[PDB]
Amino acid sequence: PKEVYLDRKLLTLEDKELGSGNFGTVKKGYYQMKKVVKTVAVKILKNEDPALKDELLAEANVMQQLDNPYIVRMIGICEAESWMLVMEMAELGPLNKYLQQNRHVTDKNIIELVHQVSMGMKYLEESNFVHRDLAARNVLLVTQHYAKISDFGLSKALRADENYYKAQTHGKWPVKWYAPECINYYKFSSKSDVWSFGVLMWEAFSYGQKPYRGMKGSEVTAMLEKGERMGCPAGCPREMYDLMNLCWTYDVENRPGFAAVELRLRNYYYDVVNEG
Numbered sequence: 001p002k003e004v005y006l007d008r009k010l011l012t013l014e015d016k017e018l019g020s021g022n023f024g025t026v027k028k029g030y031y032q033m034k035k036v037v038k039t040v041a042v043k044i045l046k047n048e049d050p051a052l053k054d055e056l057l058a059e060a061n062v063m064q065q066l067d068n069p070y071i072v073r074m075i076g077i078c079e080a081e082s083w084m085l086v087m088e089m090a091e092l093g094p095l096n097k098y099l100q101q102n103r104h105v106t107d108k109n110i111i112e113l114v115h116q117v118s119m120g121m122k123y124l125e126e127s128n129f130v131h132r133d134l135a136a137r138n139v140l141l142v143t144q145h146y147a148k149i150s151d152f153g154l155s156k157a158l159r160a161d162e163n164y165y166k167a168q169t170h171g172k173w174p175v176k177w178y179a180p181e182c183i184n185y186y187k188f189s190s191k192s193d194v195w196s197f198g199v200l201m202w203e204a205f206s207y208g209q210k211p212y213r214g215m216k217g218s219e220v221t222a223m224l225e226k227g228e229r230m231g232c233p234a235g236c237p238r239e240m241y242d243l244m245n246l247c248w249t250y251d252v253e254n255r256p257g258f259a260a261v262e263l264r265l266r267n268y269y270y271d272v273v274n275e276g
């Protein structure tokens with residue numbers, strides 16, 4: 001898969017930031033393609049670390065190897081005043097911010113969105129990729145009923161003869177989204193992404209509230225070790241809280257993979273639609 005370079009002269013950027021990803025500040029832009037001016041999201045590597053350039057280009061490369069309706073598509077790379085990763089713009093933005101601003105969104109609509117995420121994740125697992133940053137801030141809404149997975153900055157392609165990535169450097173990690181085996185032994189698998197998916201589901205049903213609010217990483221570790229978990233969000237269906245708890249199975253061997261998770265979501269979604 002060859003890198004696609006874009007022409008800086010055909011790209012216009014707005015100064016208002018959409019937010020930041022693992023390896024860059026993201027701004028809304030416009031890419032002049034033939035006669036159509038296409039709205040885009042541009043991740044700009046400021047780098048206020050020489051390895052950071054390699055991390056952004058690896059993220060672009062991971063995106064180019066993926067092709068799924070629930071995974072953000074990249075348009076190309078632009079090497080100009082900074083290294084830039086140009087991707088398709090998800091107009092409604094991150095799920096957590098969207099739900100904080102739209103408390104009227106139904107439980108049925110949330111189920112549809114997290115089910116779409118589980119489908120993209122099942123595809124990722126089958127392809128031998130680990131996401132390593134699965135959280136509501138990285139689920140982007142194209143429309144109110146169409147979510148896509150984003151930010152592949154920490155993602156890794158596993159070799160066909162391995163089932164986990166061993167981190168060599170303990171960097172700035174989103175510990176509240178990480179499974180115990182990640183925190184304790186630096187081992188990241190698709191099952192570790194399932195744990196993160198459970199936290200994502202809690203964030204979605206809590207309308208973008210922060211998980212484990214005010215707690216230190218050590219307090220979260222202590223809580224999980226003794227078999228305790230975040231509470232059931234107000235109005236969250238029992239089946240969805242039970243699925244969160246299954247994603248939060250402590251022992252990685254006994255935790256379900258995304259095929260089991262997507263099946264439970266698909267079944268519950270069809271029960272919700274068909275009950276009324």
Ligand SMILES: C[C@@H](Oc1cc(-c2cnn(C)c2)cc2nscc12)[C@H]1CNC(=O)O1
Pocket residue numbers: 018019020021022026041043072087088089090091092093094137138140150151152
């Ligand atoms: C900054 C944010 O990325 C994006 C954010 C928004 C966005 C934000 N607000 N609004 C309305 C829209 C749209 C996007 N389309 S493609 C990437 C983004 C994080 C999440 N993933 C990532 O790589 O960085």
